[PDB]
Amino acid sequence: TIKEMPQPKTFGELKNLPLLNTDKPVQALMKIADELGEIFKFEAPGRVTRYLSSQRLIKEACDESRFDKNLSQALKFVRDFAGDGLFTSWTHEKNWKKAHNILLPSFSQQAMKGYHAMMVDIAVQLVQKWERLNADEHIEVPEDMTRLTLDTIGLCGFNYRFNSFYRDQPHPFITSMVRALDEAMNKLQRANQFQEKVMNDLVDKIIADRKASQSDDLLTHMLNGKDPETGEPLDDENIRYQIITFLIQGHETTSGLLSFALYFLVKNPHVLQKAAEEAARVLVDPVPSYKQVKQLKYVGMVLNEALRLWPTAPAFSLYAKEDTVLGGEYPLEKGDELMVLIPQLHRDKTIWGDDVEEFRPERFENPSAIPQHAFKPFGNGQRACIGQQFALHEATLVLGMMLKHFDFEDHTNYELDIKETLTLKPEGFVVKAKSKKIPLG
Ligand code: HEM
């Protein structure tokens, strides 16, 4: 019948908060999930949410007629900077559907074919960097993947060159971002520099570059493109929010993906061997064609399996549109919040079998077999990732070229250490790459 909701122990007015005293809250919540099962309530001073981990409950939560996207505490801080951009707007905010309609054509297959050459530009810069390292040198994986993904969104979206590969520290734009992503995550564990405004020069420079300057990219649609429903273009204030949104969303999760993918490949030599052999076979030309990337079937499986284990945007939040009952057992009142613990969803033994921790790309051999709402690294419904096909094309292309051009060594026997900034990264992951001395075009 009507069930009492599991909940970890509460400590007076502190509630459950002393159980999340960590820089790694998602990983801590995964342990609580292992303990309490498919749903638990979590209270902190003043606020309450319910963590879901099973495909059966999340499939219900994914019913857009009953639950909509909620801005979690973390997203409410990002909203200070990203405003009512796509990622930090409520669905019922006018600018949400408006920008969605305006910007969606920028991710059509075709706009995607139109991005490929610029993707290859940044990818060649990555490969050339690693070709040019001396014998005594190693690669800082997440740091270089971030150089690539930031430059890729810069160039494809905004025809702006961040020139991240001409810098040996992260781009100044990144360095701001990283501090605000962590401080928003830390502000949650507070029961009782963040203001220091840096990226607005960058935004000005992106718009001004375009002002001067034959482009048909994301920025063009932001600037000119009007919403078929209402006839309205985006206003200036919202355009600035969208630029910021796409610069942060357009690079951070993709970089984490590539990093985890390389991690899992160097830990699984037989998977690496097969992935490498596909890359050599398919990529027969000096630089990859759009069509060839689509032929990298096993590399795509490798990426989906990295997202299964460590989805780089690991949670999303929902709220009950009306009073409702969840799972036929848990009554919810209007406004009650739910969080989808994606890494936990992706370990549901009832869906995946009981080797959920193993890195097996062949799970994705025939994807239509995978139940609905079992695999959700890109979110849900109308508020799902708009950039999904962009991210996967970029990553497939890049991983393909890496595997074609180098042999990789896990030279420090790296121990996985996952840093959380509301995206996930394998912090400190380093490798050595031995060139196969295949020329570029
Ligand atoms: C593997 C890489 C990526 C992952 C795992 C990922 C994941 C996600 C997830 C889980 C959401 C839903 C957020 C929520 O429900 O609160 C989302 C939304 C969003 N993502 Fe992605 N993302 C990736 C790459 C990208 C890229 C490359 C772009 C842009 C080029 C992008 C742009 C966006 C935008 C604008 C939204 C808000 C969409 C809306 O609500 O209308 N993402 N993403």
Question: Closest Cα to atom 6, ligand 1: which residue?
Answer: 378
Q: Is 73 helix (H, G, I), strand (E, B) or coil?
A: helix
Residue 248 CA to ligand 1 center (angstroms) comes to: 10
Q: How many domains does the chain have?
A: 1
Please work out, in degrees rounded to the nearest 5, the angle formed at the alpha carbon of residue 153 by the alpha carbons of 194 and 130.
Answer: 100
| CATH number, domain with residue 371 | 1.10.630.10
Query: How is residue 413 written in tokens?
Result: 């026997």
Report strand pairing: 47-52 vs 337-341. Answer: parallel
Residue 386 CA to ligand 1 center (angstroms) comes to: 6
Residue 230 CA to ligand 1 center (angstroms) comes to: 25
Q: Alpha-carbon dihedral of residues 206, 212, 217, 222, nearest 10 degrees? A: 70
Strand segments, DSSP code E, in 45-126 are 47-52, 67-70
Mutation test residue for ligand 1: of 68, 160, 385, the one with most atoms within 8 Å of CB: 385
Which helix (H) or strand (E) is 424 found in, with range? Answer: strand 424-426
- Residues near ligand 1 (Cβ within 6 A): 69, 86-87, 100, 153, 245-246, 249-250, 253-254, 257, 311-313, 316, 377-379, 383, 385-387, 390-391
Question: Closest Cα to atom 40, ligand 1: which residue?
Answer: 383
DSSP annotation of 368 reads: G
Mutation test residue for ligand 1: of 244, 249, 262, the one with most atoms within 8 Å of CB: 249
Residue 115 labeled ligand binder: no
Q: How was this structure determined?
A: X-ray
Please work out, in degrees rounded to the nearest 5, the angle formed at the alpha carbon of residue 45 by the alpha carbons of 2 and 18.
Answer: 95
Q: Is 212 helix (H, G, I), strand (E, B) or coil?
A: coil
Residue 56 CB: number of other CB atoms within 10 A?
15
CA distance 302 to 10: 41
Which residue reads 């740091």 in tokens? 143
Q: Of 331, 347, 340, give the one whose Cα is nearest residue 5.
A: 331
CA distance 233 to 253: 29
DSSP annotation of 23 reads: S
Question: Closest Cα to atom 12, ligand 1: which residue?
Answer: 379
**Residues facing residue 423 across a β-bridge:** none
Q: Which atom of ligand 1 is nearest to the CA of 103?
A: 35
Q: Of 421, 425, 343, give the one whose Cα is nearest residue 352.
A: 343
Q: Which atom of ligand 1 is nearest to the CA of 246?
A: 29
Please work out, in degrees rounded to the nearest 5, the angle formed at the alpha carbon of residue 69 by the alpha carbons of 327 and 200.
Answer: 160
378 annotated active-site: yes
Residue 387 CA to ligand 1 center (angstroms) comes to: 6
Are 292 and 404 a contacting pair, CB within 8 Å?
no
Domain that holds residue 81: 1-441
DSSP annotation of 322 reads: S
- Supply the angle between the helices 141-158 and 252-267 in degrees, to the nearest 10: 140
Question: Closest Cα to atom 23, ligand 1: which residue?
Answer: 253
Measure CA 270 to chain center. 27
Residue 385 labeled ligand binder: yes
Resolution, Å (one decimal): 2.1
Question: Closest Cα to atom 25, ligand 1: which residue?
Answer: 387
- Supply the angle between the helices 269-282 and 297-309 in degrees, to the nearest 10: 140
Residue 378 CA to ligand 1 center (angstroms) comes to: 6
Report CA-CA distances (Å) from 348 to 114, 342, 358, 412: 38, 10, 13, 32
- The residues, ordered by sequence, that sit 6+ positions from 386 with a Cβ below 8 Å of its Cβ are 86, 100, 103, 104, 107
Q: Of 70, 171, 399, 90, give the one whose Cα is nearest residue 263.
A: 399
Question: Closest Cα to atom 16, ligand 1: which residue?
Answer: 316
